[PDB]
């Protein structure tokens, strides 16, 4: 089982990545944005960083992240 810790503003979310079409960085950013919307009613567009390094939205989660990695999400706009 794979899960990623994503910081969105002052909130830290444990987001699971369940298992056949592999999920992209963009999908993970979308999950984090929904988790953030569920807390406060604002829907951000997010770019993800791992230890300061930008994650490409089109890259696949298993190629750039391991279970329990921590990711910083940056709000680039509000939808």
Question: Please, could you describe this protein's structure?
Answer:
With 79 residues, the chain is of the alpha+beta class. It has one domain (2-78): Phosphatidylinositol 3-kinase Catalytic Subunit, Chain A, domain 1 (Ubiquitin-like (UB roll)). 25% of the residues lie in helices and 41% in strands. The protein has 2 helices and 5 strands, in the order E-E-H-E-E-H-E. A 5-stranded mixed beta sheet has the order 2-1-5-3-4, covered by helices on one side. The longest helix has 16 residues, at 25-40. This is Tonsoku-like protein. It is found in: Nucleus; Chromosome; Cytoplasm.
Keywords:
79 residues; alpha+beta; 5-stranded mixed beta sheet; 2 helices; 5 strands
Beta fraction: 35-45%
Dominant shape: globular
Helix and strand string, N-terminal first? EEHEEHE
Helicity, in percent?
25-40%
Structural class: alpha+beta
Widest β-sheet, arrangement of strands: 2-1-5-3-4
CATH architecture: Roll
Q: What would you give as the CATH superfamily?
A: Phosphatidylinositol 3-kinase Catalytic Subunit, Chain A, domain 1
Number of strands: 5
CATH first level: which class?
Alpha Beta
What is the tally of helical segments?
2
Cα-to-Cα separation, first versus last residue? 31 Å
Family: Belongs to the Tonsoku family.
Protein name: Tonsoku-like protein
Subcellular location: Nucleus; Chromosome; Cytoplasm
PDB class: chaperone
